[PDB]
Design an enzyme around this catalytic site. Structure first.
Site, PDB file in Angstrom:
ATOM      1  N   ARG A 255       5.104   8.264  -4.290  1.00 38.09           N
ATOM      2  CA  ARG A 255       3.867   7.701  -4.824  1.00 38.09           C
ATOM      3  C   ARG A 255       3.457   6.440  -4.070  1.00 38.09           C
ATOM      4  O   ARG A 255       2.300   6.301  -3.658  1.00 38.09           O
ATOM      5  CB  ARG A 255       4.026   7.407  -6.316  1.00 38.09           C
ATOM      6  CG  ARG A 255       2.872   6.618  -6.912  1.00 38.09           C
ATOM      7  CD  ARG A 255       2.984   6.522  -8.425  1.00 38.09           C
ATOM      8  NE  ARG A 255       2.251   5.377  -8.953  1.00 38.09           N
ATOM      9  CZ  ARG A 255       0.934   5.335  -9.111  1.00 38.09           C
ATOM     10  NH1 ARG A 255       0.166   6.365  -8.793  1.00 38.09           N
ATOM     11  NH2 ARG A 255       0.374   4.233  -9.601  1.00 38.09           N
ATOM     12  N   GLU A 357      -2.991  -9.035 -15.048  1.00 35.23           N
ATOM     13  CA  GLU A 357      -2.844  -8.888 -16.491  1.00 35.23           C
ATOM     14  C   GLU A 357      -3.849  -9.739 -17.256  1.00 35.23           C
ATOM     15  O   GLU A 357      -4.335  -9.318 -18.311  1.00 35.23           O
ATOM     16  CB  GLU A 357      -1.416  -9.228 -16.912  1.00 35.23           C
ATOM     17  CG  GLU A 357      -0.369  -8.300 -16.318  1.00 35.23           C
ATOM     18  CD  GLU A 357      -0.444  -6.894 -16.886  1.00 35.23           C
ATOM     19  OE1 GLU A 357      -0.968  -6.730 -18.008  1.00 35.23           O
ATOM     20  OE2 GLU A 357       0.021  -5.953 -16.210  1.00 35.23           O
ATOM     21  N   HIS A 360      -6.978  -7.898 -17.216  1.00 38.78           N
ATOM     22  CA  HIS A 360      -6.939  -6.944 -18.318  1.00 38.78           C
ATOM     23  C   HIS A 360      -7.325  -7.619 -19.626  1.00 38.78           C
ATOM     24  O   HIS A 360      -8.112  -7.074 -20.410  1.00 38.78           O
ATOM     25  CB  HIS A 360      -5.543  -6.333 -18.435  1.00 38.78           C
ATOM     26  CG  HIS A 360      -5.299  -5.180 -17.513  1.00 38.78           C
ATOM     27  ND1 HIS A 360      -6.178  -4.126 -17.386  1.00 38.78           N
ATOM     28  CD2 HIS A 360      -4.268  -4.913 -16.677  1.00 38.78           C
ATOM     29  CE1 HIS A 360      -5.699  -3.261 -16.511  1.00 38.78           C
ATOM     30  NE2 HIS A 360      -4.543  -3.714 -16.065  1.00 38.78           N
ATOM     31  N   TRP A 459       3.352  24.392  -5.251  1.00 34.74           N
ATOM     32  CA  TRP A 459       3.490  22.940  -5.178  1.00 34.74           C
ATOM     33  C   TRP A 459       3.803  22.481  -3.758  1.00 34.74           C
ATOM     34  O   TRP A 459       3.248  21.483  -3.283  1.00 34.74           O
ATOM     35  CB  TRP A 459       4.579  22.475  -6.145  1.00 34.74           C
ATOM     36  CG  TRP A 459       4.568  21.004  -6.418  1.00 34.74           C
ATOM     37  CD1 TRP A 459       3.612  20.303  -7.092  1.00 34.74           C
ATOM     38  CD2 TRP A 459       5.561  20.049  -6.024  1.00 34.74           C
ATOM     39  NE1 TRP A 459       3.948  18.972  -7.143  1.00 34.74           N
ATOM     40  CE2 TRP A 459       5.139  18.790  -6.494  1.00 34.74           C
ATOM     41  CE3 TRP A 459       6.766  20.138  -5.321  1.00 34.74           C
ATOM     42  CZ2 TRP A 459       5.880  17.628  -6.283  1.00 34.74           C
ATOM     43  CZ3 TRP A 459       7.499  18.983  -5.112  1.00 34.74           C
ATOM     44  CH2 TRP A 459       7.054  17.745  -5.591  1.00 34.74           C
ATOM     45  N   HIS A 487       4.643  10.019 -15.378  1.00 36.66           N
ATOM     46  CA  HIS A 487       3.367  10.347 -16.006  1.00 36.66           C
ATOM     47  C   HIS A 487       3.365  11.767 -16.560  1.00 36.66           C
ATOM     48  O   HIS A 487       2.939  12.002 -17.696  1.00 36.66           O
ATOM     49  CB  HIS A 487       2.232  10.160 -14.999  1.00 36.66           C
ATOM     50  CG  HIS A 487       2.203   8.803 -14.368  1.00 36.66           C
ATOM     51  ND1 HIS A 487       2.865   8.515 -13.194  1.00 36.66           N
ATOM     52  CD2 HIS A 487       1.591   7.655 -14.745  1.00 36.66           C
ATOM     53  CE1 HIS A 487       2.663   7.249 -12.875  1.00 36.66           C
ATOM     54  NE2 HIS A 487       1.894   6.705 -13.800  1.00 36.66           N
ATOM     55  N   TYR A 497      -5.610   6.650 -11.863  1.00 36.81           N
ATOM     56  CA  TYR A 497      -5.347   5.873 -10.657  1.00 36.81           C
ATOM     57  C   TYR A 497      -6.296   6.261  -9.530  1.00 36.81           C
ATOM     58  O   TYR A 497      -6.674   5.417  -8.708  1.00 36.81           O
ATOM     59  CB  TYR A 497      -3.891   6.058 -10.232  1.00 36.81           C
ATOM     60  CG  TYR A 497      -2.904   5.463 -11.212  1.00 36.81           C
ATOM     61  CD1 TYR A 497      -2.625   4.103 -11.211  1.00 36.81           C
ATOM     62  CD2 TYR A 497      -2.264   6.262 -12.151  1.00 36.81           C
ATOM     63  CE1 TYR A 497      -1.728   3.556 -12.109  1.00 36.81           C
ATOM     64  CE2 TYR A 497      -1.366   5.724 -13.054  1.00 36.81           C
ATOM     65  CZ  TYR A 497      -1.101   4.371 -13.028  1.00 36.81           C
ATOM     66  OH  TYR A 497      -0.208   3.831 -13.925  1.00 36.81           O
TER      67      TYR A 497
END
Ligand SMILES: *[C@@H]1O[C@H](CO)[C@@H](O)[C@H](O)[C@H]1NC(C)=O
Ligand SMILES: *[C@@H]1O[C@H](CO)[C@@H](O)[C@H](O)[C@H]1NC(C)=O
Ligand SMILES: *[C@@H]1O[C@H](CO)[C@@H](O)[C@H](O)[C@H]1NC(C)=O
Ligand SMILES: *[C@@H]1O[C@H](CO)[C@@H](O)[C@H](O)[C@H]1NC(C)=O
Ligand SMILES: *[C@@H]1O[C@H](CO)[C@@H](O)[C@H](O)[C@H]1NC(C)=O
Ligand SMILES: *[C@@H]1O[C@H](CO)[C@@H](O)[C@H](O)[C@H]1NC(C)=O
Ligand SMILES: *[C@@H]1O[C@H](CO)[C@@H](O)[C@H](O)[C@H]1NC(C)=O
Ligand SMILES: *[C@@H]1O[C@H](CO)[C@@H](O)[C@H](O)[C@H]1NC(C)=O
Lengths: 595, 530, 48
Positions: A255, A357, A360, A459, A487, A497
């Site tokens: 990722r 944050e 946020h 996949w 996830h 994302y």
């Protein structure tokens, strides 16, 4: 006397009575997260049972009037969200099984421990220990062993689990008048009843494909340079024409490519833009770290913090006796309470995360005037994107010089901009092929397009074509590689994302154009710009009341997805990639030539 | 542009005798062979008049204006130019300016930034002020002009009119009499308390010739003016100079024959102004309104009527914790002296963000559904922090509010209905089902909130006046009774003038004030001390 | 002059002075905008 007036009288009462319980649900969750104790666990469970049942008890009492006769857009949007069946559409037995299936994947992942055979005296958990060896170790086989051993054991214990997950999730969506569970996630971006700003759920997949057709040329040059750099680290185990080994991405799932900076450093001799030594030299405690941010957030035009936030939020580790959750999370407790849960360190990353944050949190009270049910972002992408953009400005060397972190005599040479851009390419450009493939894969398994016995083969072939990464060994259907991710195994949306990435650069360009910046996007900052905040504040205050297409048009001028800001941000790096990619081959091949 | 002058010589102010100068024609009417008496502002005879001299002497100070000014200038070659007027002599307040250049006379009334040392400079320069933004009055006229030139001027500021008089006489002040004639009236309508003078400097670095000007002050008094057969004032008598002139001013003549005459009476004029009212008792009970242990909810706001007492609004105004003291339609300062029939104390507790809704013409949950204020609302609203009292860590659910109603609440109307609100087609029938909830929600406060959501104890005062006698009055301040001196007394509305002394009289306990044989109030009893 | 001196949103072009330390003389005009003082604490240019 009209049915629409009934809807007018149903929301405000529901909103406030939720606020009294949402805070208690949030406060008990905050109380659990600030000091974990057995009583704090059950207070969350009691509040969580009360909060979940309160929504369910009104869910039964919210779905017996049609929504085609209600004209108020906010009111119609509020009722549609509340009418959403969720887990209530199945029978009690099926719902009891689906939640346990959801629960049994979490406990398996949370307790997932992989250790060496013939050494069972102690074993190592994934998050504490396996993550450390995942990027710091430079051994091909040892990292391959952990990559193979984890997915072999975890895949066997989740492949039957995910088989029941997909069929049950698909059944609920069909029972909810939805084509597939992938469309249920696509229903968050659904906009109805608004002309010009109308959006279709099925349009998102082609919009993602339309956006990704320009991501690939930027990614292929980035992929080639990483492969060329990893060619030096691994001389013969990577083919120049094939894909990268699946266990050499810096993470088990591939990722994040941020771990490859040392592996793929363009100029290691030059110093970085990190000024962490200045933070400890001048004793910048977490109190003044956030206070330096507060000076920045009021410079752009956003409001400052309240007395409640400073007193109750913890910005430092409490200690050994007081055990607390250290995950950085912004808490919108409701009723005007906004707290930041961070065990902040005196570091550059935590300083960047402090802006993320608080952004946020700064998002939360912007829609404080909105109804409680609408007290959310228009889509799941705005909430994270608005926090990501401000960390972009916080990383600019000009900001560091302004707040004194960076010395005024330092020279921003071309290399340090190239090095910084590469790191941002690893976290943003690298994740998009992985962000798209997982959601695209999940969109089809809920659709049933992929054969049930051909999940893993489907996949692997696309990961070669999308991400440009090849598997070490072929994997049969007895294993389940995709479910190993956080996830997917906990039923968490992953397209957030992808939209956050596009919104982050779209918002950044819009703020920079508003701020009248005379340079590129990466050097751009939003400090000392009055008009930037008010343009930013327009979508923040709307929340979920107005369609996300409308909120986007108020900022960037376009309702739909745009990728031009992303390529403009990395354009100086994109050209640098092209210059040094003459020797290497751009792109990859689907063959297994490397391994 | 301003140029600082540092060639001054320091000297205390000189003085000289005014003699009989400073008499002006009091009116526009022709009179001949008539001894006429006038009462206006005049310069007293043989009074102290300040002496200024310039030569290295440089005199240009700031002088008070008071009621008037008599300006003289025993002059040669005309160094003196003009005058300045105002209260602060800068563009904070309006100011007046008068100039007399070699060509004409210029009068300007504009809000100047006057220099520290205004002056002039043949004449080829100008330095008086630096800026002038809002200019109101302008005017132009003809130039006014061994020492040989004697100028005399009188300036008055009554009812916004600037009266100016003048007289020239070819020649210390001379021993002679000559009346002043009116020159120009200007409706400036400004306030004047200080004034300056304007000088033109001679350069040959600057050299000042010999010049002298005198400044007096006018006082209100009576003169007796004699007009010759040609209508020109030739003699005058100051009616308050000495006892002899008082006899002439009473006999209306200038020669007094031998004898004894009765002029005026002796008056030991007063000094203070003593007002007295009874002791401050029967206070209005405002303590339990603000120092209450419990406050009612916003929807069920407690209404407290206040009557038959004295209301001390100064106590509430003097508490710092009452951060927000917003008053609409009535001045907070005059809340004491003003009297009301009934005062309604309207107490409630709300969140931080809904404080603005407590105002006439406002909207929101509280304004429309909990507490509505009329547009023509007379009274004040007081808000103070109540996090330490109205917040519990588990939650303070004791406060509730009303959110839904078929219409906005009428002003000063309290609604406490608990029936399940009905909205549309399908009747609710008291069932908390779909589109049917309770008409009341609960404020649930915690001590972990910011300034924008903390519980605030807000009490609204409703001021009304009715046909009934307004028995709610403010405190009436009583100056310490002054004794053994003429004073303007006001005891319980009994107004008069005289010397208040001690008394040996034995008033009966019920008796308040005593009268004499003349049926006039001669004895009186103080309410503070009997 | 309701036709010419009334705005639907509200006409704020007209101002009236509410606070002063003393009463003006007849036919006297005041245009000072300094913050009125009501308590012992000096204003110091603060409208608090
Ligand atoms: C520790 O957890 C308990 C659990 O109820 C909580 O009451 C307490 O406040 C926590 N300690 C601190 C210092 O917050
Ligand atoms: C509908 O009602 C909402 C209040 O929930 C309001 O914000 C919105 O403006 C209304 N829309 C129309 C068209 O009346
Ligand atoms: C939720 O489930 C109930 C029961 O089947 C159904 O009547 C209702 O229509 C569902 N909600 C929606 C929005 O369809
Ligand atoms: C935030 O700003 C307001 C006004 O600008 C100020 O009153 C308040 O004290 C500030 N908050 C903090 C924590 O400084
Ligand atoms: C950066 O730009 C300068 C400017 O000419 C150039 O000399 C240098 O080679 C560039 N370096 C990189 C890594 O692009
Ligand atoms: C932005 O404003 C702050 C607030 O005074 C100031 O300290 C800072 O220097 C400004 N930024 C720049 C680049 O001057
Ligand atoms: C002038 O003033 C002095 C001192 O104040 C005083 O002695 C003198 O009598 C005054 N002159 C006249 C004429 O009143
Ligand atoms: C009045 O005027 C006449 C002629 O002009 C003159 O003869 C007479 O002396 C004057 N009267 C006085 C008192 O000067």
């Amino acid at each position: 006397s009209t049915i629409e007036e009934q809807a007018k009288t149903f929301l405000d009462k529901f909103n406030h009575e939720a606020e009294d319980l949402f805070y208690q649900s949030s406060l008990a969750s905050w109380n659990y997260n600030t000091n974990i104790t057995e009583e704090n666990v059950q207070n969350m469970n009691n509040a969580g049972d009360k909060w979940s049942a309160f929504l369910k008890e009104q869910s039964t009492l919210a779905q017996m009037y049609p929504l085609q006769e209600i004209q108020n857009l906010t009111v119609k949007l509020q009722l549609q969200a509340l009418q959403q069946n969720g887990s209530s559409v199945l029978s009690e037995d099926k719902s009891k099984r689906l939640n346990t299936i959801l629960n049994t994947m979490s406990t398996i992942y949370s307790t997932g421990k992989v250790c060496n055979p013939d050494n069972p005296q102690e074993c190592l958990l994934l998050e504490p220990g396996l993550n450390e060896i995942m990027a710091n170790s430079l051994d091909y086989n040892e990292r391959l062993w952990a990559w193979e051993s984890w997915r072999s054991e975890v895949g066997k214990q989740l492949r039957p689990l995910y088989e029941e997950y997909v069929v049950l999730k698909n059944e609920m969506a069909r029972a909810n008048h939805y084509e597939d569970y992938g469309d249920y996630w696509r229903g968050d971006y659904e906009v109805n009843g608004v002309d010009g700003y109308d959006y279709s759920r099925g349009q998102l997949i082609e919009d993602v494909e339309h956006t990704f057709e320009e991501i690939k040329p930027l990614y292929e040059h980035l992929h080639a340079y990483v492969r060329a750099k990893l060619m030096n680290a691994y001389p013969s185990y990577i083919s120049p024409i094939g894909c990268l080994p699946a266990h050499l991405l810096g993470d088990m799932w591939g990722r994040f490519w941020t771990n490859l900076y040392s592996l793929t450093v363009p100029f290691g001799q030059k110093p970085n833009i990190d000024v962490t030594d200045a933070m400890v030299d001048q004793a910048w405690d977490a109190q003044r770290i956030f206070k330096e941010a507060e000076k920045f957030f009021v410079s752009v035009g956003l409001p400052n913090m309240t007395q409640g936030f400073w007193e109750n939020s913890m910005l430092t580790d409490p200690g050994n006796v007081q055990k607390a959750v250290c995950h950085p999370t912004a808490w919108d407790l409701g009723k005007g309470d906004f707290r930041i849960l961070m065990c902040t360190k005196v570091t550059m990353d935590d300083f960047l995360t402090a802006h993320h944050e608080m952004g946020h949190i700064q998002y939360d009270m912007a829609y404080a005037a909105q109804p409680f049910l609408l007290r959310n972002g228009a889509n799941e992408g705005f909430h994270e994107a608005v926090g990501e953009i401000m960390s972009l400005s916080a990383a600019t060397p000009k900001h560091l010089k302004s707040i004194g972190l960076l010395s005024p005599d330092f020279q921003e040479d071309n290399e340090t901009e190239i090095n910084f851009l590469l790191k941002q390419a690893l976290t943003i450009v690298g994740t998009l092929p992985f962000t798209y493939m997982l959601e695209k894969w999940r969109w089809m398994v809920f659709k049933g397009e992929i054969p049930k016995d051909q999940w893993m083969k489907k996949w692997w072939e696309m990961k070669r074509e999308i991400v440009g990464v090849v598997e070490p060994v072929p994997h049969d259907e007895t294993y389940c590689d995709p479910a190993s991710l956080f996830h997917v195994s906990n039923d968490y949306s992953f397209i957030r994302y992808y939209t956050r990435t596009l919104y982050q650069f779209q918002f950044q360009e819009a703020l920079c154009q508003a701020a009248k910046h005379e340079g590129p996007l990466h050097k751009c900052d939003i400090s000392n710009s009055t008009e930037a905040g008010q343009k930013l504040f327009n979508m923040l205050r709307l929340g979920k009341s107005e369609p996300w297409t409308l909120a986007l048009e108020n900022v960037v001028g376009a309702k739909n997805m745009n990728v031009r800001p992303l390529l403009n941000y990395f354009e100086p790096l994109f050209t640098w990639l092209k210059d040094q990619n003459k020797n290497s081959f751009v792109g990859w091949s689907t063959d297994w030539s490397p391994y | 542009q301003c140029v600082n002058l540092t060639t001054r010589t320091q000297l205390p102010p000189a003085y000289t005798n005014s003699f009989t100068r400073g008499v002006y024609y009091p009116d526009k009417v022709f009179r001949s062979s008539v001894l006429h008496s006038t009462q206006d502002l005049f310069l007293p005879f043989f009074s102290n008049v300040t002496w200024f001299h310039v030569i290295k002497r440089f005199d240009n100070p700031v002088l008070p204006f008071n009621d008037g000014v008599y300006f003289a200038s025993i002059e040669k070659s005309n160094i003196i130019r003009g005058w300045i007027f105002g209260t602060t002599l800068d563009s904070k307040t309006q100011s007046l300016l008068i100039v007399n250049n070699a060509t004409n006379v210029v009068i300007k009334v504009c809000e100047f930034q006057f220099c520290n040392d205004p002056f002039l400079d043949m004449e080829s320069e100008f330095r008086v002020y630096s800026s002038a933004n809002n200019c109101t009055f302008e005017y132009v006229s003809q130039p006014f002009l061994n020492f040989k030139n004697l100028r005399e001027f009188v300036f008055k500021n009554i009812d916004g009119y600037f009266k100016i008089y003048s007289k020239h006489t070819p020649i210390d002040l001379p021993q002679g009499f000559s009346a002043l004639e009116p020159l120009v009236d200007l409706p400036i309508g400004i306030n004047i308390t200080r004034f300056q003078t304007l000088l033109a400097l001679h350069r040959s670095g600057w050299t000042a010739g010999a010049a002298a000007y005198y400044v007096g002050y006018l006082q209100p008094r009576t003169f007796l003016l004699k007009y010759n057969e040609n209508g020109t004032i030739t003699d005058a008598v100051d009616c308050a100079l000495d006892p002899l002139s008082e006899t002439k001013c009473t006999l209306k003549s200038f020669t007094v024959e031998k004898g004894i005459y009765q002029t005026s009476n002796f008056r030991v004029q007063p000094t203070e102004s003593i007002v007295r009212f009874p002791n401050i008792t029967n206070l209005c009970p405002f303590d339990e309104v603000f120092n209450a242990t419990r406050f009612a909810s916003v929807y069920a706001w407690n209404r407290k009527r206040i009557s038959n007492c004295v209301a001390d609004y100064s106590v509430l105004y003097n508490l710092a914790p009452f951060f927000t003291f917003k008053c609409y339609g009535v001045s907070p300062t005059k809340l004491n002296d003003l009297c009301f029939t009934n005062v309604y104390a309207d107490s409630f507790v709300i969140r931080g963000d809904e404080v603005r809704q407590i105002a006439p013409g406002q909207t929101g949950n509280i304004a429309d559904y909990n507490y509505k204020l009329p547009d023509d609302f007379t009274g004040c609203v007081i808000a103070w922090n109540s996090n330490k009292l109205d917040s519990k860590v588990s939650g303070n659910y004791n406060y509730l509010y009303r959110l839904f109603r078929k219409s906005n609440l009428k002003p000063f109307e309290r609604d406490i209905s608990t029936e399940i609100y009905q909205a549309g087609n399908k009747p609710c029938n008291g069932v908390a089902g779909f589109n049917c909830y309770f008409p009341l929600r609960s404020y649930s406060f915690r001590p972990t909130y910011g300034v924008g959501h903390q519980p605030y104890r807000v009490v609204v005062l409703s001021f009304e006046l009715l046909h009934a006698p307004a028995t709610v009055c403010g405190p009436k301040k009583s100056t310490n009774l002054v004794k053994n001196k003429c004073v303007n007394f006001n005891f319980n509305g009994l107004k008069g003038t005289g010397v208040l002394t001690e008394s040996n009289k034995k008033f009966l306990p019920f008796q308040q004030f005593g009268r004499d044989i003349a049926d006039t109030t001669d004895a009186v009893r103080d309410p503070q001390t009997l």
